[PDB]
């Protein structure tokens, strides 16, 4: 089997992407944030504290003939941005782009943090990291991909995120029309539960490539590119007036700037992030200070190849017995 679903930016900055997901019988379609940095499929629901729901579409298990309470199971998750959610668990039928999994754990939120409430466009998350990170207790649950894997034509999914445009998540096949040149594959460590890999270096604009190992995670659920302070400083030094602002929470730059590109290495291959992808616009409405899309990972504890990086590539998440990651230009 295979599946193919379009993923759509939630706003004009590509802050996140939502993908329609069918849950239950008859189908209830919710727009979920596919997150290769976590491993829980959770949804706003009929159980979510009413004051914490503001415009989201909810899953109502009592209206699904295939829903079953997973008795005794609870979940609770905290994300890198400080947001969180928690609740109980149902199993139900879940379909993405025509690919169906029966008996998928659907984590029903009883509580969500303010950032979730305030974002009416995201109805929940669909985790695509390794199932070892799943938070369900006392019986850990599998991700949608893990459950689908054996049925897939090939044990892979691909992320093809758009810049200010829709893109695609495919399951079970590699669309050879969706990229240019060849795909370069690179080793993955699953030791921390992430799609963790080592970039071979970077360049800023038209500058020379610096060969240096940068360990990080491929994370579709993180907006920006978070890299070591040395790398980030070298980038922003090429933008007149750019500075790190403790009050704003990162590097800012004059909105009048033209940003240089940023290149990262994948083995001997190179992925180029155009400068425009690094512009996250005014820090507040009407400001002439703009927020940068490359930020320091210092104090996160891990480097993160978030959407800024991933949307410059066609990315293969190869879930074979020995997982790997592939990157192609597009």
| Secondary structure string (H, E, C) spanning the chain | CCEEEEEEECCCCCCCEEEEEEECCCCEEEEEEEECCCCCEEECECCCCHHHCCCCCCECHHHCCCCEEEEEEEEEEECCCCCEEEEEEEEEEEEECCEEEEEEEEEEEEEECHHHHCCCCCCEEEECCCHHHCCCECCCCCCHHHHHHHHCCCCEEEEECCCCCCEEEEECCCCCCCCCCCCEEEECECCCCCCEEEEEEEEECCCCCEEEEEEEEECCCCCCEEECHHHHHHHHCCCCCCEEECCCCEEEEECCCCCCCEEEEECCEEEEECHHHHEEEECCCCCCEEEECEEECCCCCCEEECHHHHCCCEEEEECCCCCEEEEECC
The answer to whether the CB of 330 falls within 8 A of the CB of 180 is yes
Tokens found for residue 169? 């998540």
The CB-side HSE value for 183 (13 A sphere, CA atoms) comes to: 18
Could you give the CA distance from residue 198 to residue 85 in angstroms, rounded to a whole number? 31
CA dist 7 and 138 (Å) reads 33
Asked if residues 37 and 217 have their Cβ atoms less than 8 Å apart, the reply is yes
Note whether 231 and 213 are within 8 A (CB).
no
**Rounded to the nearest 10 degrees, how much is the dihedral formed by the CA atoms of 95, 119, 282, 276?**
0
- The pair phi, psi for residue 263, each rounded to 5°, is -110, 135
By C-alpha distance, which of 87, 171, 189, 176 is closest to 130? 189
Here the tokens at position 235 are 């980038």
Residues 6+ apart with CB under 8 A from 215: 196, 197, 198, 199, 302, 303
* Cis omega (within 30 of 0) for bond into 159: no
Please give the Cα distance from 320 to 315 (Å, whole number). 15
Q: Which regions of the chain carry the CATH code 2.40.70.10?
A: 5-174, 175-330
Method: X-ray
> Phi and psi for 279 in degrees, rounded to 5?
-90, 115
- Name the one residue in this structure whose structure tokens are 């030791």: 191
Domain 175-330 is of which CATH architecture?
Answer: Beta Barrel (2.40)
Upstream peptide bond of 26 is cis (omega within 30 degrees of 0)? yes
Cα 168 from Cα 145, distance rounded (Å):
16
Cα end-to-end distance, the chain, whole Å: 25
Instruction: Please say whether the beta carbons of 228 and 298 come within 8 A.
Output: yes
Query: Is 327 within 8 Å of 183 (Cβ atoms)?
Result: yes
β-pair type (124-127, 28-35): parallel
Contacts of 48 (CB under 8 A, 6+ apart): 58, 87, 108, 109, 110, 111, 112
CA-derived radius of gyration, the chain: 20
Phi-psi region of 251 (alpha: psi -120 to 50; beta: other; left: phi over 0): beta
Residue linked to tokens 């899309």 = 293
CB 110 within 8 A of CB 49: yes
Cβ-contact 97, 3 below 8 angstroms: yes
Half-sphere exposure of 66 (CA within 13 A, CB side): 19
Nearest to 34 by CA among 189, 148, 145: 145
Give the catalytic positions in this structure: 35, 199
Backbone angles phi, psi at 202, to 5 degrees: -155, 160
Contact 280, 291 (CB under 8 A): yes
Please state, in angstroms and rounded to a whole number, the distance separating the CA atoms of residues 236 and 239.
5
CATH for 5-174? 2.40.70.10
How far is the C-alpha of 246 from the C-alpha of 298, rounded, in Å?
Answer: 13
Interatomic CA distance for residues 26 and 65, integer angstroms: 7
- Structure tokens, 83: 């947001």
In sequence order, the 6+-apart residues with CB closer than 8 A to the CB of 114 are 83
């Amino acid at each position: 089997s295979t599946g193919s679903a379009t993923t759509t930016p939630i706003d004009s900055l590509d802050d996140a992407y939502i993908t329609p997901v069918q849950i239950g019988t008859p189908a209830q379609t919710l727009n979920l944030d596919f997150d290769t940095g976590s491993s829980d499929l959770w949804v706003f629901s009929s159980e979510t504290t009413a004051s914490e729901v503001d415009g989201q579409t909810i899953y109502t298990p009592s209206k699904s003939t295939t829903a079953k309470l997973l008795s005794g199971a609870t979940w609770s998750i905290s994300y890198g941005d400080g947001s969180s959610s928690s609740g109980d668990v149902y199993t139900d039928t879940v379909s993405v782009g025509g690919l169906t999994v029966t008996g998928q754990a659907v984590e029903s939120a009883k509580k969500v943090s303010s950032s979730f409430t305030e974002d009416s466009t995201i109805d929940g998350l669909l985790g695509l990291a390794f199932s070892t990170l799943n938070t369900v207790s006392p019986t850990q649950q599998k991700t949608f991909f893990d459950n689908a894997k054996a049925s897939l034509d090939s044990p892979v999914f691909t992320a093809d995120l758009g810049y200010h445009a829709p893109g695609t998540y495919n399951f079970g096949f590699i669309d050879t029309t969706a990229y240019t040149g060849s795909i370069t594959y690179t080793a993955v460590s699953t030791k921390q539960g992430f799609w963790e890999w080592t970039s071979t270096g970077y360049a800023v604009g038209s500058g020379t490539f610096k060969s240096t190992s940068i360990d990080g995670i491929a994370d579709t659920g993180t907006t920006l590119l978070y890299l070591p302070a040395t790398v980030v400083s070298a980038y922003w030094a090429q933008v007149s007036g750019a500075k790190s602002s403790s009050s704003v929470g990162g590097y800012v730059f004059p909105c009048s700037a033209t940003l240089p590109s940023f290149t990262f290495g994948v083995g001997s291959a190179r992925i180029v992030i155009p400068g425009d992808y690094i512009d996250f616009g005014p820090i507040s409405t009407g400001s002439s200070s703009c927020f940068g899309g490359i930020q320091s990972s210092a104090g996160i504890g891990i480097n993160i190849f978030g959407d800024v990086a991933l949307k410059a590539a066609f990315v293969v998440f190869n879930g074979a017995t020995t997982p790997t990651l592939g990157f192609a230009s597009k």
